[model samples]
Target chain A: LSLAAVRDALVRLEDSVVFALIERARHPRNAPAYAPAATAGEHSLVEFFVREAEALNAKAGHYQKPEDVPFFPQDLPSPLFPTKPSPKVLHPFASLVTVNDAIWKMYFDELLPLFTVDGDDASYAQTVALDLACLQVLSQRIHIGKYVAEVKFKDAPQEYSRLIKEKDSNSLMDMLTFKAVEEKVKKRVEKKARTFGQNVTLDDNATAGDSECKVDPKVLSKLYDQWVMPLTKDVEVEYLLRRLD
Target chain B: LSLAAVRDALVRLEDSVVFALIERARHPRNAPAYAPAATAGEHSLVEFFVREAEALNAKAGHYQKPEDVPFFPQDLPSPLFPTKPSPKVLHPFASLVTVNDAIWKMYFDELLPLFTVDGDDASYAQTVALDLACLQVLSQRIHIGKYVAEVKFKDAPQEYSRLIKEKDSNSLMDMLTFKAVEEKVKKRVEKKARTFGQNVTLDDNATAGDSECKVDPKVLSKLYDQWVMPLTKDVEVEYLLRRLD
Candidate 1:
């Protein structure tokens, strides 16, 4: 697919990720409830639940697609029917575009506190569900680096071959980094946040400042700069490093 | 306020949090958008935006409320008008339940992947805005431990005072934990996810299993049991240990 098509898909996927966070932020971080599972060795309650849930999803053919990667890759039950083989369009190193570890740590440690308030109504499960949703979206985003890199390489094989021959990761990174494109992304996201999170009121005279948004626009921009973009680049760099191998 | 009242508020807050996530999920991570500002010293574009935004919000009296906490407290401007002092319901130690550092790390590293998919459409600003919403909500939840501890102590001061004197955090944790209540919370959140996230269609025969929810109900339940509940309890313990001080 063209880069435009990929970008379009990303734009659409943003809806799912944004809504998931809104849903997850509904509850407080109730830590004790997620303590190590009694039956699952070394597994937290959430991990245990994810494993079971993944198995169930596996039975339903959730992992049949290349886009879906289970957190617990081992010991998953086989799908009932054979999965349709996906077209191979990625580089051999494309699979290295995993950023789940960072995403997981960031969500639990940093992201949760931004929107949620203090209080416990015991809504941990709901929070985790939203978390899962968020994770899925991020994983997809990170993995798409494979496609991004592939497209870039195809567009300029002469330039990339020189760097790939020498295995020059830094040069490849600089090549991939687009400051202008990044600027546009930030501004667009901020606008979208404002548009999507604004309160719908009956009053037409309600100018922008008067209506309280469900989310802070500044924070959305910050998230992209601090976490999302950096990690996507990380995926890109990692995938490129292994490209020649 | 009774615990019931606190829970009632939590139930209502769910809508805001959930909606915010949905809005946020609409954008990709778009990391380049967040690169450190060229002229703004060490601040990323996102950080610069946040600082500026907070300054504006402060002028508008956003931080005058007890629930609001600024990410960049040092740079915030004084409110234009004197903020009306509200009745203090929490202990002095309650303010110590700051989990922003952890929350920030968690959301960026761990949670983003759950809902978002691969690729970039330059929507970094919207993503960060939603992130700000999620962070704010999570911060409020963690800090609200002060209130939860206060209510629990008032309900049974004698029982809590003994532990406070001994500085027994573990015992206080057990005291605050209610398994039955947590069970109810998990169920309620799952039901809410089903109700709120389901695809609205004209087909009536869309029984329970037929409709694919925007978010998985089981994941919602797991989040409570794993992350949300444990973190809230962590806040409670930390707040309670300092309650007698």
Candidate 2:
């Protein structure tokens, strides 16, 4: 895959993640909604919801491609339609980057408190729906690091081969980490957050001022620095680790 | 504030957050946009962007109310308008429920992965703008927990007084936790996600089949159960802790 093309796709993915977050933030953390309930089998309400939803999506053929990975892979119905042609870009082992466990804990224990305000409106279902959207977006972005690593390796096999052979994950990470590019990415996201989150007023000039954005631009930036980039890098490393296999 | 009024406003807020997420999900997580750079001062590019943006927003009066908290509160300009009257409903200690740090981490580290799809489209600015929207929505919801606690305390001051005086966070938490309400909330959001996130087709019947939703509904439920609910309790407990003060 072309690196430029991959980067371009990443740009688009940013919008999905950001929007999903905004949606989930609408409600407070209704703690009881997530707790394991007698009615929801062994899982929390959300887990049950996803498991069932995934099964439905499975029937509809959502996971027929190389891209869509299910949070619950087991018990999914077989696809009704013929499978999509596989791009075969990612190494077989690249698909092993299942970071959902960490993502789940982080969202609950760490990120939810930062952006989401306090108080319960009892909009637990809506909140979790938003959570799913954000989770899938994050998973897609991070998991795609496999494709990114693949493209980079193909572009410069000679350099990457030695590291791959040596199983040097750290060097691979270094090679993938572009400080200047990363800087630009963060600033760009912050700017976007500002621009998109700006309050709409009757006055055209009002947009220029610091009206209330739907979300905090700084928080968005921090998200990139603290989680998005790191997770992506993790995916890249994970994918690279199994590249030679 | 009337509990009904608060709940109504929250319901409306849910729509905004959910829609914002759908919008953001259109883009990918462009990794480079969030990196720290020499040009962006001592902070990452996103940090600089937010600080500058917040400064601009401060000029326009984004934080004139007790409700709105800034990530970079130290250097913001004075608001242009006279400050809004503080509702005074929340206890002074309620202000201490500053959970942005955790929210920020959760969004970046956990929630970002769930909803977004993989690959970049170079729409970095647009993507981050969406991120900002989600972050703000979440911040507003979580921070407002102080108000929720205040209202609840007002409704049953005698009962809560003992808990507040005793600083019995567990008891307070138990009082706020409602498993039945939580269950209904989770179910409601799933339906909402399904209804809202569905693809519209000329054939109404097409909607019946398991067409891919913009977001998975069950994931929404799980978000509530997993993150949204727990965080709200945390905020409520926090607010109650300082209520007596």
Candidate 3:
């Protein structure tokens, strides 16, 4: 119920985000996946695959979990084996505060070119499959900001209620952001990317050229400094704005 | 195809198999998932999920790739967006060969007990989802034995044919098994697990208790020794026995 506990959970998930990126890095970017005009449809090829796969996941009760927020939730089939919903913690309106649209746009546009390899192998299907993997963890982590906001509000209702009289415009963002905590979060993920993606060889660990990693540490740090944290803060402050609703 | 090239591709995939196992280890064994009597159907809960997921993956052209052999192929829906198959590399009948049955059985029976934590969180659906991820990579790696055999047979067609005159009564096994290469593969995966799964901390490395790892490095090494290499060899000689056909 405390901020420390909530933040602790998100810290555990950063490892997952890094691992997904590492897995997707195994294949080239497969540019045809995001070629909007190449397909004669409203959706890009990657978007099309996510929609269909989300439908399957929905049937298997994937979105039943609080953390799983689908990219195409409107079109999702109802979960076939609906588990009882968890007791409500956040406000009912809190569910509406998702940054998935921005999350989707940012991943395909800003992030992929930076991290994934340039060449194409026509493995668009697998590439898109792994993209969904990355997207879900990314979404899950960012959306946890809702619970983070809830814990803060519950901890000090009067303080949050007084301040949430207004919203966003980073005035509120500044209120939620902790420079030191954010620094630690970014540094931790950078270390994780560096540790997890290194090439494993047996030798003096190969007494040759310097070792290489599958992902760049700085980019993963940038992922938080620029997108993930900002969007998560967006979710947090926005949810708090309506905390009284 | 050179034997070295085929082996190199398999090496690239070892990282993937390790990553998938690490991901699945996030959840407990979720044993109720595999209990046949829990549900009134022929399939266990995990089996039901895999079949459903495989059906969705099938429609998305997942099985079109030579590497992605499905666990339950008999019931698969044909790919909706069928791309032309890659130029026939292995024998035409080679597509019929797979170690998926033993792969699935070994994972649930022997392997899960060793690596996955024993508990239940009722996250059976997600547990089963990640299990499928582990299963596919395991199947993909082990089934690469077909292509490994093809490369060897193509490299020395007459030598294999003379041997194909017999079977896996260990005579051919002796010819095929390389203790040194198998030893290296195990060590490579072991180092990978150790390197990838280490706990990351800041400070004088936080000066905490000895850092723990998400997975036991030894178990990953034992993986290749006990099942992966054996199943791969089982696939290799079996595929070669019919090469002349």
Best by DockQ: 3
Top TM-score hit: 3
lDDT of 2 at B14: 54
Compared with the true structure, what per-residue lDDT tens digits does model 2 show for residues B214-237?
776666677668876677678878
Model 1, span B120-185: residue lDDT tens: 653443445457667666666555655677788898998899998898978888898889988877
Whichever of 2 and 3 has more DockQ, that candidate is: 3
Each prediction's RMSD over C-alphas, in Å, is 18.7, 20.1, 2.5
State each model's TM-score restricted to chain B. Answer: 0.85, 0.89, 0.93
- Estimate the lDDT of model 1: 0.63
Which parts of model 3 are misplaced by more than 4 Å? A36-43, A82-85, A167-169, A206-211, B37-40, B204-211
Q: DockQ for all models, in order?
A: 0.04, 0.04, 0.62
Q: What are the runs in model 2 whose C-alpha is more than 4 Å off?
A: A37-41, A207-211, B1-245
| Fraction of native contacts (fnat) of each candidate | 0.06, 0.06, 0.62
Model 1 ranges with Cα > 4 A deviation? A33-42, A205-211, B1-245
- Fraction of real interface contacts that model 2 preserves: 0.06
Question: What is candidate 1's CAPRI-style docking category based on DockQ?
Answer: incorrect
